[PDB]
Every structure is written in structure tokens, then in C-alpha cells.
Amino acid sequence: KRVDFCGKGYHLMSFPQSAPHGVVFLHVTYVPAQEKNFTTAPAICHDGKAHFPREGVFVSNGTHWFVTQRNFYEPQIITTDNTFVSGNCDVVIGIVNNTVYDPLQPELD
Amino acid sequence: AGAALQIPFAMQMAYRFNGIGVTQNVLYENQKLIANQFNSAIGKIQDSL
Numbered sequence: 001k002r003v004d005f006c007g008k009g010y011h012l013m014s015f016p017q018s019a020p021h022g023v024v025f026l027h028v029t030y031v032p033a034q035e036k037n038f039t040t041a042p043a044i045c046h047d048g049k050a051h052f053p054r055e056g057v058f059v060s061n062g063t064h065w066f067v068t069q070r071n072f073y074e075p076q077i078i079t080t081d082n083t084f085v086s087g088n089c090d091v092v093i094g095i096v097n098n099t100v101y102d103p104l105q106p107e108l109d
Numbered sequence: 110a111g112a113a114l115q116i117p118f119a120m121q122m123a124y125r126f127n128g129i130g131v132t133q134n135v136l137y138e139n140q141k142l143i144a145n146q147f148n149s150a151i152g153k154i155q156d157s158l
């Protein structure tokens with residue numbers, strides 16, 4: 001996890017080869033590509049409660065809000081298993097209104 | 110690690126709080142105090158210099 005100790009990018013793995021009086025390291029790394037821009041927010045307010053992502057960031061495609069993982073764009077809908085709650089929505093700078101979906105009660109019809 | 114991708118600075122500070130074991134609500138609920146403390150700490154360096 002040391003930055004730039006094993007090449008440029010996120011180190012995946014490395015292979016050694018012998019040279020005359022030396023060694024050659026072939027570093028395999030992961031390099032992110034083809035980014036898009038989005039709107040973002042730190043928390044989400046629902047029922048007077050602030051919701052934070054467990055892992056990921058809240059992003060908006062223009063009209064809807066999703067959670068994604070931070071390094072590869074893979075959007076999902078914001079549920080109570082995606083997030084955790086802390087406090088009320090009066091203290092966070094930049095909080096946004098949206099609905100956080102519960103699975104249990106629409107299972108219970 | 111590649112191309113520069115923008116992110117707002119308080120959200121970068123929250124990632125970094127996660128990287129030491131503190132949840133990020135602890136940053137967002139203290140943002141103003143944390144920024145005051147950083148500013149006083151930076152203002153103390155030029156005084157010693």
C-alpha cells in the first residue's frame with residue numbers, strides 16, 4: 001500500500017526476473033480510466049435524521065441519488081443497509097433531501 | 110495514481126478520517142472546529158519561523 005514503491009497506480013502484483021548482476025521487477029498495477037463528473041453530497045436527510053454512506057459516496061446523475069463505491073462507478077439505490085444514521089439534519093454543511101428505502105416494511109405489505 | 114479527479118475538500122478530509130479509524134460523521138459534525146484548529150496550527154508555524 002506504499003505509494004509508488006511498486007510502480008504507478010494501485011499495486012496488484014509483481015514478478016521478478018534475473019538480469020546480469022541485477023534484478024528486473026515487472027510491476028502489475030491498476031489504473032483508473034474514463035471518468036465522469038457527478039453532483040455529490042456528504043449526507044442525506046430523511047425523517048429528520050442524517051444518513052452517511054457505509055462505504056461509498058452519494059452521487060446524483062442529474063435527478064436521482066445513488067451510492068457508489070469510490071473507485072469504480074457502480075450505482076445502487078440508497079437503503080438502510082447502505083447507510084448508517086447519526087444525529088439530525090441541522091449540523092452537516094451541504095446536507096440534501098432524499099428518501100432512504102427500507103426493505104422490511106415493503107416486505108410486510 | 111492516474112488522472113486528477115476532483116472531490117470537495119471536506120469530503121476528502123472525511124475519507125482521511127476513515128483512513129485512521131474514525132467515522133466520518135465525527136468530521137462532518139465538527140467541521141468548523143477542525144478547520145479553526147488547522148488554521149491556528151498553520152498560523153503558529155510562521156510565527157516560529
Ligand SMILES: *[C@@H]1O[C@H](CO)[C@@H](O[C@@H]2O[C@H](CO)[C@@H](O)[C@H](O)[C@H]2NC(C)=O)[C@H](O)[C@H]1NC(C)=O
Pocket residue numbers: 061062063064
Ligand atoms: C438517472 O437514472 C435514472 C435511473 O434510475 C433515470 O430515471 C428513470 O427511472 C425510472 C424509475 O426509476 C426507470 O424506469 C427508467 O428506466 C429510468 N430512465 C429513463 C430514461 O426513464 C434517469 O433518467 C437518469 N437521469 C439522467 C439525467 O440521466
Ligand SMILES: *[C@@H]1O[C@H](CO)[C@@H](O[C@@H]2O[C@H](CO)[C@@H](O)[C@H](O)[C@H]2NC(C)=O)[C@H](O)[C@H]1NC(C)=O
Pocket residue numbers: 093094
Ligand atoms: C458552494 O458554493 C456556492 C457559492 O458559489 C454556494 O451557493 C450559495 O449559497 C448561499 C446559501 O448559503 C446563497 O445565499 C448564495 O446565493 C449561493 N451562491 C451561488 C452563486 O449560488 C453553496 O451553498 C456552496 N455549497 C455548500 C455545500 O456550502
Ligand SMILES: *[C@@H]1O[C@H](CO)[C@@H](O[C@@H]2O[C@H](CO)[C@@H](O)[C@H](O)[C@H]2NC(C)=O)[C@H](O)[C@H]1NC(C)=O
Pocket residue numbers: 045096097
Ligand atoms: C429538506 O426537507 C426539510 C424537511 O421539511 C426542509 O425543512 C423545512 O425547511 C423550510 C425552509 O427552510 C421550513 O420552512 C420548514 O419548517 C422545514 N420543515 C421542517 C419539518 O423542519 C428543508 O428546507 C429541505 N431542504 C431544502 C433544501 O429544501
Ligand SMILES: *[C@@H]1O[C@H](CO)[C@@H](O[C@@H]2O[C@H](CO)[C@@H](O)[C@H](O)[C@H]2NC(C)=O)[C@H](O)[C@H]1NC(C)=O
Pocket residue numbers: 142145146
Ligand atoms: C474539544 O476541545 C476544543 C479545544 O480545541 C474545545 O473547543 C474550545 O472550547 C473552549 C471552551 O473552554 C473555547 O473557549 C474555545 O474557543 C474552543 N475552541 C474552538 C477552536 O472552538 C471543545 O469545546 C472541546 N469539546 C468537548 C466536547 O470538550
Ligand SMILES: *[C@@H]1O[C@H](CO)[C@@H](O)[C@H](O)[C@H]1NC(C)=O
Pocket residue numbers: 035036037
Ligand atoms: C467535468 O466538468 C468540468 C467542468 O465543470 C470539465 O472541465 C471536465 O472536463 C468534466 N470532466 C468529465 C469527465 O466530464
